[PDB]
Design a protein around this ligand. Structure first.
Ligand SMILES: Cc1cc2nc3c(=O)[nH]c(=O)nc-3n(C[C@H](O)[C@H](O)[C@H](O)COP(=O)(O)O)c2cc1C
Length: 369
């Protein structure tokens, strides 16, 4: 199976193409430091050598943090906690990218030090008022771009194999890409190229920091989560941005389906064919959102037959429920049914560390360490 073939992504020689998608689980402390057992969570999911894992979204600066109990990577205590997580993954011969974000208008205003700190590309709330975000100034944009680069340096210094730039799901970068939020009249909004500029410049600064082979970029072009996915020129806007990502030669593009607002409207393009076409055949593409063992297999096989041979699939919910997911899929073992109780848990070991391995995997584990 194509899905089981080794694939080089960035500097990492992956041994199969099933990826742990970035998933926020709120197991960080009030200082943004991952809890001491976060290392066992990622270690569990480093089940099979040559797996790539992508971390939960990680904050870049204390001012940009939008939630409590999510991790950052600006402070020394955070960076040391992540070094230990990354060490555990590498000890199991797996690879890990740190996903970097800022929440912008989707931050929890109760968590911000000042109401001034709720920022976006423009003063457009997610819901009809809705506390109003403040439009970033030119200098604040420049500062945010440098903060992403410095976070990327911190990540690479903690040992991460790479960073993913969180350009999706209506968070701050996507708030610049999409006209349903960005109504700026300066060079950061007001046309397809101008709206794309924020994502292009964050990407360029992170590339200068760590090199294109340690940077992936996530987008969710069709997603309607958090006020996105409604602009009239949605397709052209992302065709343009993905052409620029391809020109910048990033290690991978990651495209994900999210929450679709009306289930009676069919989705236009479940496997993102329209965008994969612009990205091209040569560089790895990660697809996420709604896949299972059979559909991950089918889409990778059929894309390969269509010349798109460099496709990986990332799983969020099944990697939560199934720590040995790639082992299971390769051995024809059923993935663990996931449950909403665990998705909506916070802080505890319960609903986090306590999904079992397959009995099969346990059978091979029957030895003294
Ligand atoms: C609990 C939960 C937390 C998530 N947190 C993030 C996040 O931190 N970063 C991000 O880019 N996507 C996040 N996602 C989206 C996942 O990466 C993925 O796109 C989503 O789970 C859909 O894929 P699935 O069908 O395999 O679950 C999250 C999803 C869930 C279920």
């Amino acid at each position: 199976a194509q899905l089981f073939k080794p694939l080089k992504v960035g500097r990492c020689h992956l041994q199969h193409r099933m990826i742990m998608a970035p998933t926020t689980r709120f197991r960080a402390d009030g200082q943004g430091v991952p809890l001491p057992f976060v290392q066992e969570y990622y270690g569990q999911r480093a089940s099979v050598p040559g797996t790539l894992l992508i971390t939960e979204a990680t904050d870049i600066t204390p001012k940009a943090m939008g939630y409590k109990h999510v991790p950052g990577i600006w402070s020394e205590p955070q960076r040391e906690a992540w070094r230990e997580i990354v060490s555990r993954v590498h000890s199991k011969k797996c690879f890990i990218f740190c996903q970097l974000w800022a929440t912008g208008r989707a931050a929890d205003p109760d968590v911000l030090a000042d109401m001034k700190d709720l920022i976006s590309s423009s003063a457009v709330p997610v819901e009809e008022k809705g506390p109003l975000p403040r439009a970033l100034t030119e200098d604040e944009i420049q500062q945010c771009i440098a903060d992403f680069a410095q976070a990327a340096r911190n990540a690479i210094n903690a040992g991460f194999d790479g960073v993913e730039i969180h350009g999706a799901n209506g968070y701050l970068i996507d708030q610049f890409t999409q006209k349903s939020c960005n109504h700026r009249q300066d060079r950061w909004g007001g046309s397809i190229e101008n709206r794309a500029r924020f994502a292009v410049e964050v990407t360029r600064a992170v590339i200068e920091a760590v090199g294109a082979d340690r940077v992936g970029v996530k987008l969710s072009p069709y997603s309607q989560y958090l006020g996105m996915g409604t602009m009239d020129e949605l397709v052209p806007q992302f065709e343009y941005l993905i052409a620029q990502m391809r020109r910048l030669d990033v290690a991978y593009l990651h495209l994900a389906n999210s929450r679709w607002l009306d289930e009676e409207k069919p989705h236009p393009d479940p496997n993102h064919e329209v965008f994969v076409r612009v990205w091209g055949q040569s560089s790895p593409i990660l697809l996420a959102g709604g896949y299972d063992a059979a559909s991950a297999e089918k889409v990778t096989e059929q894309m390969a037959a269509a010349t798109y041979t460099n496709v990986a699939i990332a799983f969020g919910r099944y990697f939560i429920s199934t720590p040995d997911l790639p082992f299971r899929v390769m051995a024809g073992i059923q993935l663990q049914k996931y449950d909403r109780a665990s998705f909506y848990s916070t802080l505890s070991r319960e609903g986090y560390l306590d999904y079992p391995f397959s009995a099969e995997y346990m059978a091979l584990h029957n030895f003294p360490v």
